[PDB]
Design a protein around this nucleic acid. Structure first.
Ligand SMILES: Nc1c(C(=O)NCc2ccc(F)cc2F)c(=O)n(O)c2ncc(CCS(=O)(=O)CCN3CCOCC3)cc12
Ligand SMILES: Nc1c(C(=O)NCc2ccc(F)cc2F)c(=O)n(O)c2ncc(CCS(=O)(=O)CCN3CCOCC3)cc12
Ligand SMILES: [Mg+2]
Ligand SMILES: [Mg+2]
Ligand SMILES: [Mg+2]
Ligand SMILES: [Mg+2]
Ligand SMILES: [Mg+2]
Ligand SMILES: [Mg+2]
Ligand SMILES: [Zn+2]
Ligand SMILES: [Zn+2]
Lengths: 367, 182, 367, 182
DNA sequence: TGCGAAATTCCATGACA
DNA sequence: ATTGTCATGGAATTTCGCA
DNA sequence: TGCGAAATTCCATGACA
DNA sequence: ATTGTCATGGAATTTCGCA
């Protein structure tokens, strides 16, 4: 009010250009601007005005200003608009992000077989012999896959299947998503008893299990082809599909998962006989160099408007199963530690420490 | 002549009958002739059905060129012959009453029969749960002739469960007493 | 057999390079190639060999050849491999496509209000006052939207809601997806009785209704924000959201749907008063030029591996609701007419004429 | 002075009571003062509740600066005054027993009362279904003073349903007879 | 005739079952 | 017989205020 | 030392709940 | 406290067969 009082008598105030005629009309300070005559409200009334214009339809920066600009003008209107956008809780948790995640990491292939297992469940499927799910275990180094039909994606069915598998070899690490079968205390006990470190994907991010997920696609794709025109009796086909995929060439690797695991084909059709004259010790020597020279992809180019996490940044976690007409994002939280450009720890919306993928995060807008 | 390789020859035989453990009585022993790698499959009978059911699990991982066994009924049946022919597996039998294998396989089957007995005493009906750990021991047992374990010969890597401190493989004086009573 | 007979005695045959020693061993014609000794099977046996190698895991071109190359060699092996891939029905209907659709078309904005309505249903939603769905009617020219709560996405609820709406004006065209409420004979009769042409999107392609679909997002987004912390009682908010969105500025257009429809704001907050001194006839004159000078987007650049439909091409339609372990694509069909680079008519897998979007099509591989 | 514009003033009034049609007895008539555009809302009573319920539908499309009406109870109630104040709508009443509107609005309300009667005869209980088509006729009726229909003045475009062949708006000798009997 | 800052425009991002 | 759309907020670009 | 064609490599596309 | 993956088939590139 006092600030606007000096403007009417011709005195200069920083932010208000001098080349405009500031007058009074109907008890309101006005100004003749090129767009027309606009009301200059006092400083004490500008927060409420921006709030009323925004609350009409909870619009963003430009759509809110265009409302205010129809009646009012003051120095740095968007600065006050953005100030309210960052304080509107409903917008922060409901609006979608407009910044893509950073480029994906391509973690190094495990150096040796049985260094890391990727396990996951497929299902539910059409009932076949009373079985509904399939436990899929993929060796990260070789891609060699084991298939186990189960009646439920349970810890008991996982333990019983992995006990049979671990008869051949014990893995260093078993990687899995955070499903109920793999996060149960019983499964952790089973792994500790055998000296196996349980590695868990960030929640709701199947990309992290992409090794076994991508194998799931080939399993279902092969099962689909073998079941064309037949009833979906997939139980008896699991051994067929397991053997077929384990002996299938990867065109980019030039080897099959069987070859990367054993260094020699078994009595399967079209078995490679290149190392027939070599000895087993010479074969394993050639196999060890093959396992090291395998092609490995690199991180792709970042998209032109990506964002990378910084310690202390306000980020919001995507809501897992958002109910109808409910916000898609949790309230803002702080980045505690940046494990890699794609994985961070945040102070959860419940107060806990949560390790999440940036794919399930957005940077809180307007700082 | 071609050097011996894994999957060139699988030696199979039945061990049993044993005390019942979760409804199973026999153990189908499959040994790779080159690496000495051993697979143990519990069956309910030394039948062609039980053999096919267990070898279908193994042949879904790797198929041998040749399967060697004695003239047991489960192996000389026409059903098992058709099963082997359908998978391109040549059957090879030892002369009746003249079991023929290999030095490595003979000693491997010896270790299996002895290692089974050492853990049968005290818990004769709980060996089904122990078959996983028995295979790990057999397949990570250092071979004096080849200076490599079956695991190393099959995968070309060291195992995450090496078995340096191995058992005596001989019955202690107390285990010997609690066995004659059974 | 006779063809291979001349090759063993040193005679030249086209396709077989002369600089190799073709010999016989164990009753099979062989050749000493750099990769090793490979068996040259007779012409009469090569189709069965490619079939056996492919049928192992129904692999594509390279993964099938790598199997055959382990044992055999003959002139132009991939030519025989691709020949079988194009004849394998299971692969053609199960494999995913690797060619993206052509760039989207940006159809011209309707010149006048009520030239074309885009209608669609939102729901089901949490029960509010016994209502579960929302009929959304968007005027294509203005974006002006009408909201109608219904208990079901039915033709009767559509007719009752549009009878109230058509009290204000009758549209030339009503565009909708092929849902049950809009494809019923009763709805066609209702539109013919009022001289309204019913335009239908291609099936299972909500992009075609993108005008009203995109408005659905804003409706739910605003409903979500207004219901934060409250029970989802959205029935009484439909008039609020309708009025709020119809008076919301589009930052790229610089106008609200209300302004594009009426040329003057009503007694809503922050009403624009620029044309206050103009007459209504001068206002409508300014409105008619605004409706023509509106920004219109252009077709984006085609992706580096897109495909455009050609009359007579073998294409496959995506299966609508593919059951578990069932193929994702229908059997190949022929393009009858190319309506636009994104829409074609095909001879359906049932024998009918079907107008489909290329987004729900893939080109049949291997011609 | 500012030229008259749409949404500057809405003239509202009740027509009724009428013969029951699907449970409705009255018709709330809303006319824009500048364009002559007419909205028809059927109500069950000339009450503030029924008026708010119908004007809430209209004010969800466009809000007038001023609502004009006579001193009817539904419009002079404190509930309706609070409803108008909550939406920034100034209420404006004509003097009791001195109905004041505008020449355009007076003639528009005349056409409505006459057009309703012409279609009431023969089907006096089926006018609820006819309210949509009545609004189309009224809003596409050529205005002699402005030389534009209410539709053209409100939207700035021609209508897809022009009404060139209009009714007589006068009762034929047969409709006049079948009305005195009712 | 050019500077710094504010204002405007640009536009990749994502979600409409 | 038909076809994506557009609010969003940092960034890029233009315009403004002043000299 | 270079040509045409075959062979190999490249890699955008899409789907794994 | 953790991280995408890879079969696929036209296209781009390289290699082969021959001179
Ligand atoms: N969605 C799943 C997909 C999937 O979509 N694949 C599709 C897919 C998409 C993109 C991609 F690149 C790969 C991919 F496979 C999946 O594959 N698999 O295997 C899943 N497996 C388990 C669960 C339940 C997870 S959960 O509900 O149990 C979490 C409980 N708690 C976690 C900790 O926080 C509290 C809650 C989901 C999925
Ligand atoms: N999936 C729908 C979405 C949707 O996903 N939106 C999400 C979406 C995704 C991408 C996009 F860019 C926009 C978009 F809105 C939808 O919005 N709306 O509105 C729908 N409306 C009806 C039906 C049923 C169609 S159906 O089953 O009735 C077909 C019956 N017949 C047709 C003829 O052939 C025989 C079968 C589905 C949807
Ligand atoms: Mg999972
Ligand atoms: Mg999965
Ligand atoms: Mg025997
Ligand atoms: Mg729909
Ligand atoms: Mg929709
Ligand atoms: Mg009255
Ligand atoms: Zn908001
Ligand atoms: Zn196939």
């Amino acid at each position: 009010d006092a600030e606007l009082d000096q403007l009417l008598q011709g005195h200069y105030i920083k932010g208000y250009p001098k080349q405009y005629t500031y007058f009074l009309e109907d008890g309101k300070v006005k100004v003749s601007r090129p767009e027309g005559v606009k009301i200059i409200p006092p400083q004490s009334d500008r927060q409420k005005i921006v709030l009323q214009a925004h609350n009409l339809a909870h619009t963003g920066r430009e759509a809110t200003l265009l409302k205010i600009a129809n009646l009012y003008w003051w120095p740095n209107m968007r600065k006050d608009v953005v100030k309210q956008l960052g304080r509107c809780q409903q917008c922060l948790i409901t609006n979608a992000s407009n910044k893509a995640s950073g480029p994906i990491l391509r973690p190094d292939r495990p150096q040796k077989p049985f260094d890391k297992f990727f396990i996951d469940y497929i299902g539910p499927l059409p009932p076949s012999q009373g079985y509904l799910y399939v436990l899929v275990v993929v060796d990260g180094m070789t891609g060699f896959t084991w298939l186990y039909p189960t009646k439920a994606p349970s810890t008991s069915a996982t333990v019983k299947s992995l006990n049979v598998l671990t008869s051949i070899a014990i893995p260093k690490v078993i990687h899995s998503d955070q499903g109920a079968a793999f996060t149960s205390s019983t499964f952790a006990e089973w792994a500790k008893e055998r000296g196996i470190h349980l590695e868990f994907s960030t929640p709701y991010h199947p990309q992290s299990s992409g090794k076994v997920e991508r194998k799931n696609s080939d399993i279902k794709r092969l099962l689909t082809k073998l079941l064309v025109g037949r009833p979906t009796k997939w139980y008896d086909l699991l051994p067929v599909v397991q053997l077929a995929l384990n002996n299938t060439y990867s065109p980019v690797l030039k080897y099959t998962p069987h070859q990367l695991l054993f260094g020699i084909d078994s009595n399967t059709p079209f078995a490679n006989q290149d190392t027939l004259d070599l000895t087993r010790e010479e074969e394993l020597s050639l196999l060890q160099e093959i396992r090291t020279s395998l092609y490995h992809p690199s991180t792709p180019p970042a998209s032109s408007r990506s964002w990378s996490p910084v310690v202390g940044q306000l980020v919001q976690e995507r809501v897992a199963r958002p109910a109808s007409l409910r916000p898609r994002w949790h309230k803002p939280s702080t980045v505690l530690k940046v494990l890699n450009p794609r994985t961070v720890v945040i102070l959860d919306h419940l107060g806990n420490n949560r390790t999440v993928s940036i794919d399930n995060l957005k940077p809180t807008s307007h700082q | 002549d071609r050097p011996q390789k894994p999957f060139d020859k699988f030696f199979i035989d039945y061990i049993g009958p044993l005390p019942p453990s979760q409804g199973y009585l026999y153990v189908l022993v499959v040994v790779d002739g080159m690496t000495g790698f051993t697979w143990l499959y519990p069956t309910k009978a030394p039948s062609t059905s039980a053999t096919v059911k267990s070898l279908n699990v193994l042949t879904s991982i790797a198929i041998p060129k040749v399967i060697h066994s004695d003239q047991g009924a489960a192996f000389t049946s026409s059903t098992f012959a058709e099963w082997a022919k359908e998978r391109g597996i040549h059957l090879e039998f030892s002369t009746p009453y003249h079991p023929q294998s290999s030095g490595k396989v003979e000693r491997k089957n010896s270790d299996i029969k002895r290692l089974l007995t050492k853990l049968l005493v005290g818990r004769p009906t709980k060996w089904y749960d122990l078959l996983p750990v028995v295979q790990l021991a057999l397949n990570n047992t250092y071979s004096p002739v080849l200076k490599y374990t079956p695991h190393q010969l099959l995968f070309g890597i060291d195992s995450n469960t090496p078995f340096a401190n191995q058992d005596t493989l001989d019955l202690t004086r107390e285990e010997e007493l609690s066995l004659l009573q059974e």
